[PDB]
Amino acid sequence: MGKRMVVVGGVAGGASAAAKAKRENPELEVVVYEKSGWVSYGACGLPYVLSGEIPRLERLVARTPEEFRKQGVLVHTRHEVVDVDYELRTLTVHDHAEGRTFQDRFDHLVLATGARPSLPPIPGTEQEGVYTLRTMEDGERLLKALPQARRAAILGAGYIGLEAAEAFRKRGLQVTLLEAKDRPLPHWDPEVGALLKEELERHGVEVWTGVKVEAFRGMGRVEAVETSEGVVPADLVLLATGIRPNTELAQAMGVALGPTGAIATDERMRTNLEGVYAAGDVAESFHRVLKRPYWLPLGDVANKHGRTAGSVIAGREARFLGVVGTAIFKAFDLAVATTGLSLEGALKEGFWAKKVFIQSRDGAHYYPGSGPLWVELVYEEGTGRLLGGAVVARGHGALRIDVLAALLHREGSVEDLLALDLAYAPPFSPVWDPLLIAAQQAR
Amino acid sequence: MGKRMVVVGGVAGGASAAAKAKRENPELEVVVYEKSGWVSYGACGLPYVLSGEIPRLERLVARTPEEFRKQGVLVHTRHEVVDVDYELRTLTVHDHAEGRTFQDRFDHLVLATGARPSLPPIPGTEQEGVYTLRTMEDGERLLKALPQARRAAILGAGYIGLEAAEAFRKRGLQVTLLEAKDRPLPHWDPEVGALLKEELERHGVEVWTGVKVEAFRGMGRVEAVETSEGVVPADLVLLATGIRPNTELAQAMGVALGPTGAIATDERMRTNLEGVYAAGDVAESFHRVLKRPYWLPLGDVANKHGRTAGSVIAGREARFLGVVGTAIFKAFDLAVATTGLSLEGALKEGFWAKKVFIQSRDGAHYYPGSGPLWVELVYEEGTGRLLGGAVVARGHGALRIDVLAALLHREGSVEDLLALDLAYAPPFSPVWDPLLIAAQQAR
Ligand SMILES: Cc1cc2nc3c(=O)[nH]c(=O)nc-3n(C[C@H](O)[C@H](O)[C@H](O)COP(=O)(O)OP(=O)(O)OC[C@H]3O[C@@H](n4cnc5c(N)ncnc54)[C@H](O)[C@@H]3O)c2cc1C
Ligand SMILES: Cc1cc2nc3c(=O)[nH]c(=O)nc-3n(C[C@H](O)[C@H](O)[C@H](O)COP(=O)(O)OP(=O)(O)OC[C@H]3O[C@@H](n4cnc5c(N)ncnc54)[C@H](O)[C@@H]3O)c2cc1C
Ligand SMILES: *SCCNC(=O)CCNC(=O)[C@H](O)C(C)(C)COP(=O)(O)OP(=O)(O)OC[C@H]1O[C@@H](n2cnc3c(N)ncnc32)[C@H](O)[C@@H]1OP(=O)(O)O
Ligand SMILES: *SCCNC(=O)CCNC(=O)[C@H](O)C(C)(C)COP(=O)(O)OP(=O)(O)OC[C@H]1O[C@@H](n2cnc3c(N)ncnc32)[C@H](O)[C@@H]1OP(=O)(O)O
Ligand SMILES: CC1=CC(=O)c2ccccc2C1=O
Ligand SMILES: CC1=CC(=O)c2ccccc2C1=O
């Protein structure tokens, strides 16, 4: 028809959804209500702004509320949707401006409220040089504190967090990372974690492994971090201890949560309620190797979510077919790419799973400047089915991970990876592509 | 058993076979006869040595006749097998050393004699500044001529040749490329070729298109290149006008040629004669999009051919499943990768084929130093079947082509491409990988 789409949250799933919806069916009244007062910005670039590589923080926005308006889309920042009157039956949508508070109705609802820092229960968190990195505001805050170094503490060695320490080190602070688990990037096989310790340490970052963080010392300021392994002086600390999906609002209106705790969806991004979709980080995506719902709070998947809901509302045929887990991030001079399951995890799932980890180059043995390039392959013993792999490079690609993800997608195997006709030339690959050498091929 | 394997030609198909067979069954008597007096070197790197980027020419050999010996493998360079007494009945092998000339017998024969420059019929080629780039010796020659610039002409705008122009400009000569067809890289869709003219011109290479070269002017030296479009002063000229497989020896012995002119082989690399195999550039490979024999004189495929013959001979189970056409090469600040069919050629084959050519980036809009990145997609109208694609980057990878190859392998479609879970992060890719945007996705 010519109905009214309301998008709650407009960072990435939300923005995505609204832009595509309005493009595909211009007859729709498309409204976005955004709590944070910036909308359509890539958080994924925050470390690069902090580090100073990117001059001003506004350089992260993809579309401004102006451009949106100029394109049929009305966005309202610093608007919080407080209640939804659902089913029940759409009055729905009470929300709060600056000054006021009011009512709206919808015919289509997109929930794209995202996710918020999960905080470990530590005394002192509440204080003053303790920071989080997740929004534009966090950006501003952190960015103010940064000149005037002097010494930083990052709890958690996940992708953000490792990303963080680069940023920090580039700003001159002395940084020290505290992770609770035994390696950096604990969510993945230890080889990789190893490589990253080395590179962290190579660059001046101190890395405490297996640390229980007891509390943050300060009189409302902060200066310490007392830990089981001693006491780290620090005058800024960052919590990079994971996220959790913002589902409070969804549960108000009785939208069903899946096993992971994010909003349960179908291939159309629909929730359990007629006319209500979910998209981005408050959403479950379906994992194709695991063959079940799974949480994958990445930027690319938020965009896919959004675009499918939009498309579907706009009355196009569109379906989101699931994810396989592929991720990549940059810590210093390493580029770390994983996908699927790790061997650790392929085993939790009960496969009879072996891993292989090799180290090759990113160019012919003889070619100037050719780096190192490792690739892992996690596979099912009997069949040979791929289930996971990583590749790490210096390279602004490799990225070669994309192939694995490809093979993962349909249920490919090590035999298949072996058959592939890859690209060879002295600047970019040895004669046998790392992926190929890793295939069966060397133990 | 413990028979005798004779490898004619030991550049890459051959070397690969010898090393693999002797590793896999050390019982074998493995002998490699090689005409050129260098063996196991990478021709692929020659531009890099010509350019000065790589110091000495010997930096390109992968294994020395010494390391081979030390490993059970006896190589004899400067030895040319002049006849084979086959079937007939293996006396077989007459060949020529320094001084002498003798007999040998075989149980296993690998033909890996490769390819030679295909020479166009122009008067004055026979002369003195006219050079070819294929073997190490060509290396040496060219390497000698090169200081003492002054002005070069290259005939042909293929990969080598384009690669050659980079090389020559790097050594300071003024270079001017002559192609007969209308674009550089004429063997692909015109968008790519366009991209390359701009980049070669941007770097001081003059590119003549649609040129008929009439003769090379000189009194045994060379100084000109008379062409339809006028007269190019040149004191070194390079013929980069393609190659043709070295099959003379094989025909002698009554090995069947395929429709391409290369030696016809099966999935085990066996020729039509019992006990005789072929590897590398003298070999047809099976094109999996075209479903027929095809000729793909690349080095990564020679190694595949080589390893397969060797493994089969040594008595392991091995099969060569085919290629899909994947190629990559570097020309200045561009890295150009292709695969499958071009639209031009997908149409020659009679598919109802469309193309799509998009320009994206190699990293988020906002990320420092993010380059451009183009990608094309040649697909069948109905089905959505991928048939070909290209990608061009500055990047040391993207290399992203590897994905299309992957999809090309089983008969993957644009729908499949679209489902793929690719890696995102700001330094390496926009939030939609270029592959994905290109998928259906923008016209
Ligand atoms: C430092 C950092 C680095 C990252 N790097 C990468 C990377 O390299 N690669 C990658 O793929 N991903 C990366 N990500 C992840 C990425 O931020 C997310 O997965 C993505 O932005 C998804 O957005 P979304 O629209 O679901 O919601 P979110 O981005 O979580 O935002 C939703 C917004 O909606 C608002 N909202 C919440 N509740 C309400 C309510 N009740 N009413 C109205 N509005 C509300 C919130 O205030 C919030 O700011 C990174 C993230 C961070 C923080
Ligand atoms: C300048 C240049 C750049 C290149 N760049 C790339 C690239 O970027 N990527 C890529 O994949 N490929 C590239 N290649 C391709 C590559 O060189 C070949 O496809 C590869 O080396 C295959 O070798 P082969 O073993 O089949 O035989 P070849 O390498 O052609 O050599 C066979 C050798 O055996 C000898 N021989 C011939 N006849 C007889 C006989 N009757 N008796 C005894 N011995 C004999 C010959 O003298 C010859 O030197 C490039 C090639 C060149 C020349
Ligand atoms: S145009 C360029 C192509 N032609 C070239 O000349 C380039 C080099 N090619 C050659 O001349 C032949 O490939 C040679 C080197 C003569 C034959 O070499 P091998 O068959 O001996 O190959 P390798 O020794 O390189 O590898 C054989 C085994 O080594 C394993 N392997 C290689 N590299 C690694 C790394 N980085 N990590 C772990 N393992 C590695 C291969 O897996 C292979 O294993 P097998 O299963 O034992 O064959
Ligand atoms: S953590 C980072 C993820 N979140 C971000 O904020 C990153 C940016 N994302 C957004 O906020 C949303 O994606 C926005 C920008 C709000 C929604 O954007 P649109 O949905 O309008 O996206 P685009 O205009 O970028 O693309 C839409 C159509 O444009 C085509 N297209 C994109 N890029 C190219 C290039 N380089 N060449 C040709 N075409 C291109 C897409 O194909 C798309 O096609 P349709 O089929 O028309 O939708
Ligand atoms: C390990 C290794 C072995 C090679 O033979 C080789 C040949 C050509 C390019 C690169 C390589 C390489 O990295
Ligand atoms: C064209 C284009 C559009 C985006 O919305 C975008 C968003 C985040 C990173 C990169 C890009 C990009 O290159």
PDB file of C-alpha atoms in Angstrom, chain A residues 42 44-45 48 53-54 59-62 296 299-300 303-304 307 321-326 328-330 335 362 365-368 395-397 399-403 405-406 409-410 419-428 431-433 436 441, chain B residues 42 44-45 48 53-54 59-62 296 299-300 303-304 307 321-326 328-330 335 362 365-368 395-397 399-403 405-406 409-410 419-428 431-433 436 441:
ATOM      1  CA  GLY A  42      30.210   3.784  11.066  1.00  0.00           C
ATOM      2  CA  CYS A  44      33.748   0.585  13.051  1.00  0.00           C
ATOM      3  CA  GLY A  45      35.928   3.569  12.339  1.00  0.00           C
ATOM      4  CA  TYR A  48      40.774   5.236  13.511  1.00  0.00           C
ATOM      5  CA  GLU A  53      44.562   8.793  11.489  1.00  0.00           C
ATOM      6  CA  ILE A  54      41.140  10.304  10.661  1.00  0.00           C
ATOM      7  CA  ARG A  59      33.977  12.027   8.870  1.00  0.00           C
ATOM      8  CA  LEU A  60      32.280   8.634   9.948  1.00  0.00           C
ATOM      9  CA  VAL A  61      28.706   9.469   9.023  1.00  0.00           C
ATOM     10  CA  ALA A  62      27.365   7.918   5.784  1.00  0.00           C
ATOM     11  CA  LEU A 296      26.726 -12.031  14.964  1.00  0.00           C
ATOM     12  CA  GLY A 299      28.349  -4.050  10.703  1.00  0.00           C
ATOM     13  CA  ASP A 300      28.063  -5.941   7.458  1.00  0.00           C
ATOM     14  CA  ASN A 303      23.348  -3.847   6.724  1.00  0.00           C
ATOM     15  CA  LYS A 304      22.131  -7.076   5.301  1.00  0.00           C
ATOM     16  CA  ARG A 307      18.277  -4.061   3.608  1.00  0.00           C
ATOM     17  CA  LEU A 321      19.968 -16.549   4.023  1.00  0.00           C
ATOM     18  CA  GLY A 322      22.213 -16.560   7.008  1.00  0.00           C
ATOM     19  CA  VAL A 323      25.783 -16.096   8.123  1.00  0.00           C
ATOM     20  CA  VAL A 324      28.900 -18.335   8.427  1.00  0.00           C
ATOM     21  CA  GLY A 325      30.755 -16.128  10.943  1.00  0.00           C
ATOM     22  CA  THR A 326      33.311 -14.295   8.849  1.00  0.00           C
ATOM     23  CA  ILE A 328      38.213  -9.290  10.099  1.00  0.00           C
ATOM     24  CA  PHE A 329      40.082  -6.644  12.024  1.00  0.00           C
ATOM     25  CA  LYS A 330      43.460  -4.800  12.043  1.00  0.00           C
ATOM     26  CA  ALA A 335      45.249  -8.169   9.603  1.00  0.00           C
ATOM     27  CA  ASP A 362      52.144 -13.010   0.619  1.00  0.00           C
ATOM     28  CA  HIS A 365      59.921 -16.022  -1.931  1.00  0.00           C
ATOM     29  CA  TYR A 366      62.002 -13.695  -4.156  1.00  0.00           C
ATOM     30  CA  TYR A 367      59.685 -10.643  -4.369  1.00  0.00           C
ATOM     31  CA  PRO A 368      60.577  -7.393  -2.518  1.00  0.00           C
ATOM     32  CA  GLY A 395      47.938  -7.466   3.671  1.00  0.00           C
ATOM     33  CA  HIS A 396      45.187  -4.774   2.775  1.00  0.00           C
ATOM     34  CA  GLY A 397      44.069  -7.904   1.601  1.00  0.00           C
ATOM     35  CA  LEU A 399      41.103 -11.531   2.954  1.00  0.00           C
ATOM     36  CA  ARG A 400      41.711 -14.733   1.194  1.00  0.00           C
ATOM     37  CA  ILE A 401      39.414 -15.637   4.038  1.00  0.00           C
ATOM     38  CA  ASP A 402      36.595 -14.732   1.696  1.00  0.00           C
ATOM     39  CA  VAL A 403      37.231 -18.045  -0.166  1.00  0.00           C
ATOM     40  CA  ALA A 405      33.566 -18.264   3.685  1.00  0.00           C
ATOM     41  CA  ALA A 406      32.517 -19.090   0.101  1.00  0.00           C
ATOM     42  CA  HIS A 409      28.524 -21.350   2.414  1.00  0.00           C
ATOM     43  CA  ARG A 410      27.531 -24.411   0.407  1.00  0.00           C
ATOM     44  CA  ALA A 419      40.638 -28.067  -6.735  1.00  0.00           C
ATOM     45  CA  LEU A 420      40.244 -24.243  -6.832  1.00  0.00           C
ATOM     46  CA  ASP A 421      41.910 -22.414  -9.578  1.00  0.00           C
ATOM     47  CA  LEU A 422      43.436 -19.526  -7.683  1.00  0.00           C
ATOM     48  CA  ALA A 423      45.357 -16.500  -8.690  1.00  0.00           C
ATOM     49  CA  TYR A 424      49.133 -16.474  -8.906  1.00  0.00           C
ATOM     50  CA  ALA A 425      51.622 -13.733  -9.489  1.00  0.00           C
ATOM     51  CA  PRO A 426      54.813 -12.882  -7.734  1.00  0.00           C
ATOM     52  CA  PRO A 427      53.519  -9.833  -5.923  1.00  0.00           C
ATOM     53  CA  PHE A 428      50.481 -11.323  -4.350  1.00  0.00           C
ATOM     54  CA  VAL A 431      53.072 -20.220  -6.746  1.00  0.00           C
ATOM     55  CA  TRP A 432      50.875 -22.250  -4.482  1.00  0.00           C
ATOM     56  CA  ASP A 433      48.262 -20.098  -2.699  1.00  0.00           C
ATOM     57  CA  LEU A 436      46.202 -24.420  -1.300  1.00  0.00           C
ATOM     58  CA  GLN A 441      48.779 -30.552   2.151  1.00  0.00           C
TER      59      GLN A 441
ATOM     60  CA  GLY B  42      60.334 -18.492 -12.086  1.00  0.00           C
ATOM     61  CA  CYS B  44      57.002 -14.823 -13.746  1.00  0.00           C
ATOM     62  CA  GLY B  45      59.516 -12.720 -11.940  1.00  0.00           C
ATOM     63  CA  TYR B  48      60.927  -7.679 -11.570  1.00  0.00           C
ATOM     64  CA  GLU B  53      63.426  -4.214  -8.114  1.00  0.00           C
ATOM     65  CA  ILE B  54      65.163  -7.618  -7.678  1.00  0.00           C
ATOM     66  CA  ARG B  59      67.257 -14.838  -7.245  1.00  0.00           C
ATOM     67  CA  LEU B  60      64.458 -16.442  -9.285  1.00  0.00           C
ATOM     68  CA  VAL B  61      65.475 -20.131  -9.157  1.00  0.00           C
ATOM     69  CA  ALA B  62      63.502 -22.237  -6.675  1.00  0.00           C
ATOM     70  CA  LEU B 296      46.053 -21.988 -19.985  1.00  0.00           C
ATOM     71  CA  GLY B 299      52.617 -21.084 -13.864  1.00  0.00           C
ATOM     72  CA  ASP B 300      50.326 -22.057 -11.098  1.00  0.00           C
ATOM     73  CA  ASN B 303      52.799 -26.779 -11.083  1.00  0.00           C
ATOM     74  CA  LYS B 304      49.397 -28.454 -10.818  1.00  0.00           C
ATOM     75  CA  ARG B 307      52.478 -32.404  -9.241  1.00  0.00           C
ATOM     76  CA  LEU B 321      40.234 -31.430 -12.084  1.00  0.00           C
ATOM     77  CA  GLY B 322      40.539 -28.551 -14.383  1.00  0.00           C
ATOM     78  CA  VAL B 323      40.855 -24.746 -14.430  1.00  0.00           C
ATOM     79  CA  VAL B 324      38.382 -21.919 -14.649  1.00  0.00           C
ATOM     80  CA  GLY B 325      40.732 -19.307 -16.153  1.00  0.00           C
ATOM     81  CA  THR B 326      41.908 -17.342 -13.243  1.00  0.00           C
ATOM     82  CA  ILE B 328      46.342 -11.854 -12.161  1.00  0.00           C
ATOM     83  CA  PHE B 329      49.029  -9.419 -13.030  1.00  0.00           C
ATOM     84  CA  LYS B 330      50.511  -6.117 -11.855  1.00  0.00           C
ATOM     85  CA  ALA B 335      46.559  -5.006  -9.979  1.00  0.00           C
ATOM     86  CA  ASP B 362      39.229  -0.849  -1.070  1.00  0.00           C
ATOM     87  CA  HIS B 365      34.921   5.869   2.341  1.00  0.00           C
ATOM     88  CA  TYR B 366      36.452   7.479   5.395  1.00  0.00           C
ATOM     89  CA  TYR B 367      39.554   5.354   5.746  1.00  0.00           C
ATOM     90  CA  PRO B 368      42.975   6.880   5.042  1.00  0.00           C
ATOM     91  CA  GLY B 395      45.612  -3.777  -3.474  1.00  0.00           C
ATOM     92  CA  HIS B 396      48.340  -6.561  -2.648  1.00  0.00           C
ATOM     93  CA  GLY B 397      45.364  -8.161  -2.606  1.00  0.00           C
ATOM     94  CA  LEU B 399      42.524 -10.904  -5.110  1.00  0.00           C
ATOM     95  CA  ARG B 400      38.895 -10.972  -4.200  1.00  0.00           C
ATOM     96  CA  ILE B 401      38.770 -12.616  -7.658  1.00  0.00           C
ATOM     97  CA  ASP B 402      39.618 -15.779  -5.737  1.00  0.00           C
ATOM     98  CA  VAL B 403      36.025 -15.773  -4.675  1.00  0.00           C
ATOM     99  CA  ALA B 405      36.898 -18.515  -9.151  1.00  0.00           C
ATOM    100  CA  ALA B 406      35.550 -20.382  -6.157  1.00  0.00           C
ATOM    101  CA  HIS B 409      34.345 -23.919  -9.805  1.00  0.00           C
ATOM    102  CA  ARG B 410      30.949 -25.662  -8.878  1.00  0.00           C
ATOM    103  CA  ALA B 419      24.428 -14.941   0.043  1.00  0.00           C
ATOM    104  CA  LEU B 420      28.122 -15.029   0.893  1.00  0.00           C
ATOM    105  CA  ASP B 421      29.216 -13.991   4.233  1.00  0.00           C
ATOM    106  CA  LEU B 422      32.163 -11.732   3.472  1.00  0.00           C
ATOM    107  CA  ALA B 423      34.620  -9.941   5.697  1.00  0.00           C
ATOM    108  CA  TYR B 424      34.251  -6.380   6.527  1.00  0.00           C
ATOM    109  CA  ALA B 425      36.371  -3.888   8.331  1.00  0.00           C
ATOM    110  CA  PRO B 426      37.200  -0.352   7.553  1.00  0.00           C
ATOM    111  CA  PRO B 427      40.754  -0.786   6.189  1.00  0.00           C
ATOM    112  CA  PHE B 428      39.959  -3.584   3.774  1.00  0.00           C
ATOM    113  CA  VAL B 431      30.556  -2.250   4.439  1.00  0.00           C
ATOM    114  CA  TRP B 432      29.230  -3.998   1.386  1.00  0.00           C
ATOM    115  CA  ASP B 433      32.126  -5.884  -0.144  1.00  0.00           C
ATOM    116  CA  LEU B 436      28.406  -7.890  -3.123  1.00  0.00           C
ATOM    117  CA  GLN B 441      22.944  -5.000  -7.152  1.00  0.00           C
TER     118      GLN B 441
END
